[PDB]
Design a binder for this molecule. Sequence first.
Ligand SMILES: O=[N+]([O-])c1cc(S(=O)(=O)C(F)(F)F)ccc1Nc1cc(F)cc(Cl)c1
Lengths: 109, 110
Amino acid sequence: FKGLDSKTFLSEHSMDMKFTYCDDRITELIGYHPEELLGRSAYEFYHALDSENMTKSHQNLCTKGQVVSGQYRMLAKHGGYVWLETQGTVIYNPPQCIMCVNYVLSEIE
Amino acid sequence: CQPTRFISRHNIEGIFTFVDHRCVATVGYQPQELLGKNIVEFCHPEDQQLLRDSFQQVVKLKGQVLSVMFRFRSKNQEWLWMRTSSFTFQNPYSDEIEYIICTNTNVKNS
Ligand SMILES: O=[N+]([O-])c1cc(S(=O)(=O)C(F)(F)F)ccc1Nc1cc(F)cc(Cl)c1
């Protein structure tokens, strides 16, 4: 059994959804090293069956400024999928980047 | 029967920069749903690295054709086998960066 902090990690993305930063906590949870994620869009990692609903959530983030994802799957480093829920927040300046708080709902399946 | 296919142009990273509207009949998306995204975003996880390595190598093959087969996620979230034939173009009157031209056909894996 894991405590809440240990199932939660932060990520940052450009407005193109590419990772620009990720907490090292992801490595124990999903297997990626943060540096291998940089430059890759979140869309490279969504299960096919979640792709249309995530595209709708991204649209909503970009119109509302802040959205919770609902339950979705991320492709894990060595195959299979982890269920996550994410709260997304756009940081607008003087949009600059998206900040994500990600919470893991399952082990790798 | 006519095979179903459409043309796309990409930057050397893989991002769609141009999509021929035949894509609607081939994969179900409007061109605007593909423009600005990397083709890898529509690719099956088992095929994604092959697709990345194929975009890397086509720029090394002296403008010759490179083909790849991979599973593409249609607008219905179904995996469709595609055969993408790609080659680079660079206008010799310039020193502008080459881009990649692709023709994308739905094919049988058999
Ligand atoms: O803006 N986003 O990058 C984002 C939005 C969404 S969203 O648009 O659904 C949201 F903002 F509503 F949550 C969801 C996720 C993500 N990013 C993300 C972060 C990860 F650690 C792993 C994966 Cl697969 C995706």
